Design a protein around this motif. Sequence first.
Motif, PDB file in Angstrom:
ATOM      1  N   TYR A 167       0.813  -1.231   0.000  1.00 39.80           N
ATOM      2  CA  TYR A 167       0.000   0.000   0.000  1.00 39.80           C
ATOM      3  C   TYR A 167       0.847   1.283   0.000  1.00 39.80           C
ATOM      4  N   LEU A 171       3.390   6.279  -2.222  1.00 31.83           N
ATOM      5  CA  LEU A 171       4.307   7.232  -1.569  1.00 31.83           C
ATOM      6  C   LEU A 171       5.729   7.254  -2.155  1.00 31.83           C
ATOM      7  N   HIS A 228      -8.153   6.235  -0.368  1.00 30.10           N
ATOM      8  CA  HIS A 228      -6.958   6.402   0.463  1.00 30.10           C
ATOM      9  C   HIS A 228      -5.739   6.734  -0.401  1.00 30.10           C
ATOM     10  N   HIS A 232      -3.198  10.703  -1.527  1.00 33.11           N
ATOM     11  CA  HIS A 232      -1.766  10.963  -1.762  1.00 33.11           C
ATOM     12  C   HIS A 232      -1.560  11.680  -3.087  1.00 33.11           C
ATOM     13  N   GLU A 268       1.193   9.423   5.645  1.00 29.14           N
ATOM     14  CA  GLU A 268       0.326   8.275   5.900  1.00 29.14           C
ATOM     15  C   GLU A 268      -0.635   8.508   7.069  1.00 29.14           C
ATOM     16  N   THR A 271      -3.223  11.262   5.612  1.00 30.00           N
ATOM     17  CA  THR A 271      -4.173  10.640   4.675  1.00 30.00           C
ATOM     18  C   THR A 271      -5.142   9.661   5.341  1.00 30.00           C
TER      19      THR A 271
HETATM   20 ZN   LIG Z   1      -1.068   5.526   2.288  1.00 27.14          ZN
END
Ligand SMILES: [Zn+2]
Lengths: 442, 387
Positions: A167, A171, A228, A232, A268, A271
């Motif tokens: 996940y 990033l 989610h 980002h 993280e 978000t």
């Molecule tokens: Zn994330």
Amino acid sequence: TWPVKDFNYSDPVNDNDILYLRIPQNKLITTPVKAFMITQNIWVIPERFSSDTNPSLSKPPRPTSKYQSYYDPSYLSTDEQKDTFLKGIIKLFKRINERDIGKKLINYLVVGSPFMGDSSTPEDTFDFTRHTTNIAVEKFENGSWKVTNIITPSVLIFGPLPNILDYTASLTLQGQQSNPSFEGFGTLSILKVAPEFLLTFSDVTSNQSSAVLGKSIFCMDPVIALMHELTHSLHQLYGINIPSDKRIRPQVSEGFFSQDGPNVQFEELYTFGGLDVEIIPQIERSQLREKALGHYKDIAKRLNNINKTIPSSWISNIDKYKKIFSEKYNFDKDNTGNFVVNIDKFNSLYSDLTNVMSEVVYSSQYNVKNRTHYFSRHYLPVFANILDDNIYTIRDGFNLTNKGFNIENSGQNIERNPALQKLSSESVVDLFTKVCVDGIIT
Amino acid sequence: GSALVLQCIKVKNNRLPYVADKDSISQEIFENKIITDETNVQVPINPEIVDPLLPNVNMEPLNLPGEEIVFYDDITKYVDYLNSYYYLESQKLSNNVENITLTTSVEEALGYSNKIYTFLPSLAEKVNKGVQAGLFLNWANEVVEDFTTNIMKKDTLDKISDVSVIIPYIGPALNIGNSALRGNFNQAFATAGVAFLLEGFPEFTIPALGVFTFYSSIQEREKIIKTIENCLEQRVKRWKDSYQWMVSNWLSRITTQFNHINYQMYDSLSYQADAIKAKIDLEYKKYSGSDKENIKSQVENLKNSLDVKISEAMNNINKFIRECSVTYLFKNMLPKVIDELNKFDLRTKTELINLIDSHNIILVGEVDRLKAKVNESFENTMPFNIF
Ligand SMILES: [Zn+2]
């Protein structure tokens, strides 16, 4: 509502919304890749992804991450699987537009294109020749790939990494790409998603649970998982992405038991949202607002002084990109005629992208069971065919009325739903903290 | 008795509590600071899709290096007693069991495959009896009756602690701090305190806060008073920001470890229900009679009722653990933070008194008497509360 266009992988290149794109960021696939535009500046590319030198979809000897890991070279290679993957995200994007916050989320992504420039570019110039804004379109002219056109996308939605359960892949940025995402200018987002594969959690800690049925092991709704990742992109596009340098680090020490965890970045926690944002103190969270403000003020002053362009043949389009980025950052106009940052409208914008747009806020809006705090236990992950309406619909997700799934007895429950199939622990890789003693004991 | 333990238990990495590093959170409150004369802080509609193509431009090839592959290793952690993870493994059923029986000893349940650990002595009696030449539901309901009443147990400790009640069967279920064998979960929890549930976790302690200083000169009229009012603003900020740091440590380090007991106790209570479900099914095969096919519908409901009755017991444990997590913040962390803040206050006050003693003659129409009375700011302090 921005409209979600329907597609098949069988549909040919029409030189409009279906194209072939050159992506230097993907090391796994050196050639150009087939792309689709599901909505304005939001493209799907049904292909696997990897940033590593000497990349491989195959399972490694030892675990490459601290997370729960699952590999599969077969996934997203054939055209039937890419057709399934394409409809999957198209279906999720329709489910995002079911609530109001999702319509608002998508709108930010569509309009908020990355600024044509950076710290290197001087105040009086638009730079139209950078990879953070541009992606190259290509024909296959006479046994070779020639560069034809470009696009200015906001979000590129790729398939998963070698590890399908990763996940944190969204990033991943490489410093030179990242610098725009810190300093207000922004950059095009490159997401690596697997809709069918789902992370799982339980409500053992949370007393808000089913007294009728009991404590359930549930899955994340793939719309929330996608939203989610899109937050980002939202942070990367509007240039308020907190750097990966700013992070929490796990403590492992002999004496007490703890997770040999990953580094949980500040992005993280933002978000995700909720109580775990307070892990970052206000002295740090205030500093990020004041930094973001300063960048937005300097970007407004750039728009006031622009006259030349790179390349030189784009001088006619100066008024075009003045209108695009003025509407993005939402500047006002002062008594001279120059652009200026309205501070009340900035605070409104910045708080919307950080506090309002977050995972804990979505889970309440979309009427779905979800992780309550970021460090909730990861249980065994699951697979699900989201394209079948008997399993998963646009309006309600897994929680369907006709199959005996109310909100307490959620369809997200793995025990009580056969459609949520489990991945075998033979394939799922894990690290282990080994509890030994080698003694007599009493 | 004793039993030579020669084998390990492989606990998964993401079934353990995340505990952040102390230095990794935020160092701002511990940093030194110099105070000056101006320290001060604080639609979508229905549109049309456009042709996204644009004219091509000459881009140079962006030479990305690429990420380096990193292989992560496992951890070995040697422990001096049969801790929670050993007590949990004893409760599990073996791969394809036959004729399981519950046992009050942990070491027997670890060694033998058929034997399974239980933390309820009364349950070990009533489960292992079986259908003793009688009816099926007579025994089966007595097991679940005994299972239910035992998981709803609550003991009322008094005199010490904000914790109203504790759940006593956590001790023999997880052996917290080697509580089982000795058999004093109730006594040890009261004596050591709420930090007992954190097995071998280093005691909380906060280092000294950052020091305030001023300029050497500060030679202008109006300037010394102009900066002393800003010094008192930064004092209130230091109390505010120290509490936020305390909460940052609590959320990332403490709360995670307390929820580990929530998860462990659910696993423990789930393995007990799996043992009862298996024993009922084994005794169901062994039983025979005219009323056997009749009760089939009723017995399956008794199996499904176990899943509901665990949640009743879990809601007590959640309530218990939530108190322990919250009372840790109040009585273990907060006093050390306030004590260090009071040291910071006394150190800052002695600095402010000596700042006025250094600068008597400048900028005064005898405002020293007025300014010395502003120490009443230190009299009141910023409180901290929960909910
Ligand atoms: Zn994330």
